[PDB]
Design a protein around this ligand. Structure first.
Ligand SMILES: Nc1ncnc2c1ncn2[C@@H]1O[C@H](COP(=O)(O)OP(=O)(O)OP(=O)(O)O)[C@@H](O)[C@H]1O
Ligand SMILES: Nc1ncnc2c1ncn2[C@@H]1O[C@H](COP(=O)(O)OP(=O)(O)OP(=O)(O)O)[C@@H](O)[C@H]1O
Ligand SMILES: Nc1ncnc2c1ncn2[C@@H]1O[C@H](COP(=O)(O)OP(=O)(O)O)[C@@H](O)[C@H]1O
Ligand SMILES: [Mg+2]
Lengths: 460, 510, 173, 169
């Protein structure tokens, strides 16, 4: 039995009046008959006199005043578990693909509290990805947040698919993709490419397109986070992909502007920091399991002081930068080793050997970048015999970082390789310490581990 | 404390009989008129976006449904309206005529013809507000749309169903590029729609005259909302054009729609929102300004054969459909960090930056490479053009850096000298006259000439005459090859050898 | 203050009472409605954010001396906008509009001592021609003025008090 | 290194007879847990009080934190012994007042902070002081004589792009 009635409709903001003893709480879900379809409304504010103010999760057109409203007493609930894998869903957990109903076993509310102080894991642990560049220069911690700063054409989506595959296969976890403000064409392309690469079954996709009202784009991240939290409770390790945190911030700004709250500096919502913390704090390592996040970041004006980047960076544990310049050399993955950083790269976290190897590699590459200016301006003759050695070693290092991905086999025509942390550490330590110096530089390109590099040199 | 529609006679009516609901919900009365926005008392059954009929065969759109009154915007002249006029809520959402008959006609955003050429033959009506096809319905864009400009078609491919933002400062040629892209589709299967928002009527009349002069008007639908028309008409106008374009897309045909000055639509919507007292956001735009442009642009898409088959009830089976949108955004002072420009940049699939400095310089097309980009890229491009354009891309990339060395290039490596005199000649070649679109055969021919080093000995001052002479020569002596290239756009050794023969034979002349 | 918001309700009520020739009953009902508003528990009830209809139906319960068909309609109309506190001002504006309609004006007279009947008669006769309305004088003689008389009608004031002359003379300084 | 310079100080006071307090405002729960583990590792935890307001907790809570810590230190200060208190991200407090303030429709000043933002820190910081023996005797009601209490404070502020000229810094 419907108990409320609509009293105001102003764009996406819908006001509903309930009997004084039945006013729904905040964040609850309502539904109404918008012609021939059910329209879900999310409660935002409880006004005096039983009037509630809600944001419509859909097209608001065609709503009449006085329509009956059914008060679902639980918050927005979405299906979770193994059944979601390989399926495309909207913010409401309805299937967007034509592949029929989801065989749900549970439905979970999207709004839940963060793990308590006593539930957090009692250790810091690295999440070995199997990619040489990432595992060496920007190691992932379990439960850490990772930002992607690369542009377009730099192989971002192939890196995402490779990470999904490696976590699903080499580990025993699952992945979730949250399309916050996705472009529909790009979402279709991503779905088809994941189908071709045969990684679709391993990952669950929830899409909020740009054409949706602001509420859907704002809440769509929470649905993916809830499914990831479901996967974590089973004891696995989970990867959560957020396609643009910046669009999450903008959707929150739009919602707050619609509600008519007072704006904040540079026009953002006054609740910017808390809205960011609510999402980010649920991505942590619990005793049962951990959720790890890779989030694409956008800088509104290349201004790193803007409140959105300033808030985002406070939660990021590592930064991965993709550059088209390295892709011009044919090196893949096109990860910049000089700008990519991780605050796990510390002797007390990764150990002294890893720290020393990474610092050595970075210093060698910086020195090479310095000497390239000398080589260009004055020529190789100026270079001493010690600087020629560092130039050759830097070229060999810069080509060793290449790696063939299992999902990129259609491009290179070579089988993918998985490299453990110790293997790449030992290989780079060897290259720096002067063993393997006699090999041709092309023996390191796209080879894999060093034990495969020596084999490649034997026939190269 | 202030009054909220508490006026003496309504209160007296409520005094007499409180249950005034006994009167039909279908009607109401105007209680306020100001700046084109009216407040209506009654209309208990009104709904968002509903058309409300006014005296004089005018209409208003119900946008604010408040607890005591309905706020509506007049879609026409409003100065003669007065409070106490009766209004009746027609139970219809805003709809416009659609069909093939609209082609060649000039209509306002309501679908009323304004060209003076009589009524419109039309295949029914479609709702102005609509929902874009879902993710599963879309299909990847891999088909070319030829603008007829060497620079655009070479470095910035446009695919059928792509959204390509034309952006630049005032008086940089955005309108010229849009209308020339309209002209080039005259002999292709693509049908064009030109939507004028906030333009002055003389400019639109001149544009229509130029369209009819080159013969493209018969393939174009013109939707006009002049600067003197009600803000609601200007704001709704792009959506009507999209609805007209969606007619072809769903039936399995290709359409190209151009929105002129989306910034003017945003200004009109801001005016409407502020007159309705909705909370302002950054730069006084309403909160959902991004939603406004996003839901409009997402309609431009390519749909798979199964969506077309389902929609047409199986009458069309093997055809996909597409709608290509070319929105126009005007940056005030080269600022792409403004609000509406940032939103439109984030929405679209690519950008064509027109620069005022280059326009002042000799390069009339003024397209700026290195900042313009198409995320669809080579998939939108024909095989021969895709093969050839990489040379241009890399040549300009190299030329950009050497421009600093141009001041004192007398003392340089001869390799650098060659790169510089090649970039300069390519940049000189890319310029093109207005209203003169080049077929794919001619663009491919001149690109082949530039890339294969045949311009190495030609002087920078004479590039244009060389191009014109080559085009006339190939049009005179080798028409079949141009026909085959225009028909297929294929590339192979049998074609490269023929082109080599063409260029060697031409180089003996002129 | 509720002065500005009370005006439409007072005007509507007065026009309705005129069309039904029941002004006196309306004035009594308005006075009663204004008295219940001043009740201490009713004041807290009115301050609370109850729903308009429940607050209205609770207000009608405390009134059994109202003409329900019209008084209940009035109260429900004011309740729907939360204007119930304006009733003491609606009453005053209703009285003012009634006095304007009956072309009758109250006048206050202040003097150092009680006036004779003949002086009162001349004052009333002069004021009736000044205003072109009937007048009703009241005398509120004052301890501070030592001579003269003050005549106040509406807000127009005529001063002949010696206190006024003393202050007006010192002003020439 | 701002947090590190501070926790090091707390560790140094392990044997100096000075009590320590660590107030975490708006910090990630994992970082707070890690800092607590490090404090316990070196044995300073038995001498410190840790007040926690995680990044996800309500803005209201993130204000009585840096004041509750001041009161806990004031206990030792008034008793006549020495304490050290290190508020973390006093900036993350100021962002929280702005939210409670803008939610209350209070007119913002420079940037978007309300004019009261100076009073907020001034009244929190001014409690850190060294008091003469007479005040200690008056407060203790004669129980403690001749000892001066103290409360040292190390507020932490975070600057964008090293801009020391911003409003809050
Ligand atoms: N390729 C070209 N060759 C020569 N002239 C050109 C070319 N392209 C544009 N022009 C000229 O540039 C001028 C501006 O063109 P257009 O009106 O299309 O600019 P715009 O950017 O749309 O301007 P506005 O913002 O004023 O509407 C016109 O005089 C037009 O003829
Ligand atoms: N004396 C030191 N020697 C070497 N490394 C140090 C030293 N002090 C701090 N660091 C390193 O500085 C890095 C950052 O330390 P810390 O987190 O305390 O900085 P912070 O400015 O407080 O960070 P945040 O701003 O995120 O709170 C860590 O790698 C830490 O080990
Ligand atoms: N291992 C690899 N080998 C060769 N090319 C690669 C590899 N990984 C990525 N790429 C390149 O990345 C490009 C596409 O990157 P992608 O992220 O899919 O595009 P976008 O950024 O536009 O979504 C391809 O052209 C491909 O050549
Ligand atoms: Mg123009």
């Amino acid at each position: 039995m419907a108990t409320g009635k609509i009293v105001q409709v102003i764009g996406a903001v819908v006001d509903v009046e309930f009997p004084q003893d039945a006013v729904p709480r905040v964040y609850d879900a309502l539904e109404v008959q918008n012609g021939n379809e059910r329209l879900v409304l999310e409660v935002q504010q409880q006004l005096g006199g039983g009037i509630v103010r809600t944001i419509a999760m859909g097209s608001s057109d065609g709503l009449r005043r006085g329509l009956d409203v059914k008060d679902l007493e639980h918050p927005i609930e979405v299906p979770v578990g193994k059944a979601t894998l390989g399926r495309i869903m909207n913010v409401l957990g309805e299937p967007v693909d034509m592949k029929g109903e989801i065989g749900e076993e549970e439905r979970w509310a999207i709004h839940r509290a963060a793990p308590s102080y006593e539930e957090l894991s009692n250790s810091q642990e690295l999440l070995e990805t199997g990619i040489k560049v990432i595992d060496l220069m920007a190691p992932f911690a379990k439960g850490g947040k990772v930002g992607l700063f690369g542009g377009a054409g730099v192989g971002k989506t192939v890196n995402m698919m490779e990470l999904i595959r490696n976590i699903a296969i080499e580990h025993s976890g699952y992945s979730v993709f949250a399309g916050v403000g996705e472009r529909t064409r790009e979402g279709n392309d991503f779905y088809h490419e994941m189908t071709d690469s045969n990684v679709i079954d391993k990952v669950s996709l929830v899409y909020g397109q740009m054409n949706e009202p602001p509420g859907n784009r704002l809440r769509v991240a929470l649905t993916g986070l809830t499914m990831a939290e479901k996967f974590r409770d089973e004891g696995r390790d989970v990867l959560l992909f957020v396609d643009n945190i910046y669009r999450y911030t903008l959707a929150g700004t739009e919602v707050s502007a619609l509600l008519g709250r007072m704006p904040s500096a540079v026009g953002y919502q006054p609740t910017l920091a808390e809205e960011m913390g609510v999402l980010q704090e649920r991505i942590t390592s619990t005793k049962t399991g951990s959720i790890t996040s890779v989030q694409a970041v956008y800088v509104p004006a290349d201004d790193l002081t803007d409140p959105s980047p300033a808030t985002t960076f406070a939660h990021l544990d590592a930064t991965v930068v993709l550059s088209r310049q390295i892709a011009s050399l044919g090196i893949y993955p096109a990860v910049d080793p000089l700008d990519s950083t991780s605050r796990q790269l510390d002797p007390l976290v990764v150990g002294q050997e890893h720290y020393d190897t990474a610092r050595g590699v970075q210093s060698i590459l910086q020195r090479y970048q310095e000497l390239k200016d000398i080589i260009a301006i004055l020529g190789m003759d100026e270079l001493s015999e010690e600087d020629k050695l560092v130039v050759a070693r830097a070229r060999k290092i810069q080509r060793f970082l290449s790696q063939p991905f299992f999902v990129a086999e259609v491009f290179t025509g070579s089988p993918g390789k998985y490299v453990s942390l110790k293997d790449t550490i030992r290989g780079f330590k060897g290259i720096m310490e002067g063993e393997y110096d006699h090999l041709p530089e092309q023996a390191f390109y796209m080879v894999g581990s060093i034990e495969e590099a020596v084999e490649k040199a034997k026939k190269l | 404390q202030l009054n909220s529609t508490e006026i003496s006679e309504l209160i007296k009516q409520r005094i007499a009989q409180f249950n005034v609901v006994s009167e039909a919900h279908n009607e109401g009365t105007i209680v306020s008129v100001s700046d084109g926005v009216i407040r209506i008392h009654g209309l208990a059954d009104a709904m968002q976006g509903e058309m409300i009929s006014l005296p004089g065969n005018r209409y208003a759109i119900a946008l604010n449904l408040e607890r005591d009154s309905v706020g509506a915007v007049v879609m026409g002249p409003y100065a003669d309206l007065a409070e106490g006029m009766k209004v009746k809520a027609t139970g219809r959402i805003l709809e416009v005529p659609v069909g093939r008959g609209l082609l060649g006609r000039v209509v306002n955003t309501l679908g009323a013809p304004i060209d003076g050429k009589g009524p419109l033959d039309h295949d029914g009506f479609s709702a102005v507000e609509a929902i874009a096809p879902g993710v599963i319905e879309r299909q990847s864009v891999d088909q070319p749309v030829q603008t007829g400009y060497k620079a655009v078609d070479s470095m910035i491919p446009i695919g059928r169903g792509q959204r390509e933002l034309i952006i630049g400062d005032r008086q940089t040629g955005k309108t010229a590029l849009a209308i020339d892209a309209i002209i080039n589709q005259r002999d292709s299967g693509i049908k064009a729609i030109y939507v004028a928002i906030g333009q002055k009527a003389s400019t639109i009349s001149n544009v229509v005259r130029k369209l009819e002069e080159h013969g493209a008007l018969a393939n174009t639908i013109v939707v006009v909302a002049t600067a003197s028309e009600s803000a609601a008409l200007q704001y709704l106008a792009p959506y009507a054009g999209a609805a007209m374009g969606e007619y072809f897309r769903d039936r399995g045909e290709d359409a190209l729609i151009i929105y002129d000055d989306l910034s003017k639509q945003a200004v009109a919507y801001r005016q409407i929102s502020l007159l309705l007292r909705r909370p302002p956001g950054r730069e006084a735009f309403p909160g959902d300004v991004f939603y406004l442009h996003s839901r409009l642009l997402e309609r431009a898409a390519r749909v798979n054969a199964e969506y077309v088959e389902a929609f047409t009830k199986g009458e069309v089976k093997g055809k996909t459909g597409s709608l290509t949108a070319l929105p126009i955004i005007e940056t005030q002072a080269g600022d792409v960090s403004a609000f509406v420009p940032t939103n439109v940049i984030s929405i679209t699939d690519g950008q064509i930056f027109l620069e005022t400095n280059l326009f002042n310089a000799g390069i009339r097309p003024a397209v700026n490479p290195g900042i313009s980009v198409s995320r669809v890229g080579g998939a939108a491009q024909t095989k021969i053009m895709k093969k050839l354009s990489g040379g241009i891309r890399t040549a300009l990339a190299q030329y950009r850096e050497l421009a600093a060395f141009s001041q004192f290039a007398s003392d340089l490596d001869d390799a650098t000298r060659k790169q510089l005199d090649h970039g300069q000649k390519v940049t000189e070649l890319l310029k093109q006259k207005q209203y003169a679109p080049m077929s794919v055969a001619q663009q491919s021919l001149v690109l082949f000439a530039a890339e294969r080093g045949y311009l190495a000995d030609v002087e920078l001052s004479k590039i244009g005459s060389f191009e014109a002479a080559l085009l006339a020569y190939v049009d005179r002596d080798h028409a079949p090859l141009m026909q085959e290239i225009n028909q297929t756009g294929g590339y192979n050794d049998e074609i490269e050898g023929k082109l080599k023969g063409i260029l060697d034979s031409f180089k003996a002349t002129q | 203050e509720f002065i500005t918001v009370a005006r439409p309700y007072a005007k509507a009520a007065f026009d309705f009472a005129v069309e039904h020739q029941s002004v006196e009953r309306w004035q009594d009902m308005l006075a009663f409605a204004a008295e219940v508003t001043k009740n201490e528990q009713m004041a807290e009830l009115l301050s609370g954010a109850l729903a308009p209809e429940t607050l209205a139906e609770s207000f009608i319960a405390v009134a059994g001396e109202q003409l329900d068909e019209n008084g209940q309609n009035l109260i429900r109309v004011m309740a729907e906008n939360g204007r119930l506190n304006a009733l003491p001002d609606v009453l005053e504006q209703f009285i003012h509009l009634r006095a304007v309609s009956e072309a009758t004006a109250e006048v206050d007279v202040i003097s150092a001592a009680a006036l004779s009947e003949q002086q009162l008669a001349k004052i009333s006769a002069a004021m009736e021609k000044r205003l072109s309305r009937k007048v009703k004088l009241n005398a509120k003689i004052d301890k501070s003025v030592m001579a003269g008389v003050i005549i106040r009608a509406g807000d127009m004031v005529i001063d002949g008090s010696v206190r006024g002359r003393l202050e007006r003379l010192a002003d020439v300084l | 290194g701002k947090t590190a310079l501070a926790i090091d100080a707390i560790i140094n006071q392990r044997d100096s007879g000075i009590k320590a307090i660590y107030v975490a405002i708006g910090q990630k729960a994992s970082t707070i847990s890690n800092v607590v583990r490090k404090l316990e590792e070196h044995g300073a935890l038995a001498n410190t009080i840790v007040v926690v307001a995680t990044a996800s907790e309500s803005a209201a809570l993130q204000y009585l934190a840096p004041y509750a810590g001041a009161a806990m230190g004031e206990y030792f200060r008034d008793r006549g012994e020495d304490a050290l208190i290190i508020y973390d991200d006093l900036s993350k407090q100021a962002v929280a007042y702005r939210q409670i303030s803008l939610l209350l429709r209070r007119p913002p000043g420079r940037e978007a902070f309300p004019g009261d933002v100076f009073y907020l820190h001034s009244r929190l910081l001014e409690r850190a002081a060294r008091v003469n023996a007479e005040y200690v005797e008056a407060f203790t009601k004669g129980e403690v004589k001749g000892k001066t209490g103290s409360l040292t404070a190390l507020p932490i502020i975070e600057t964008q792009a090293g801009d020391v000229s911003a409003f809050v810094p």
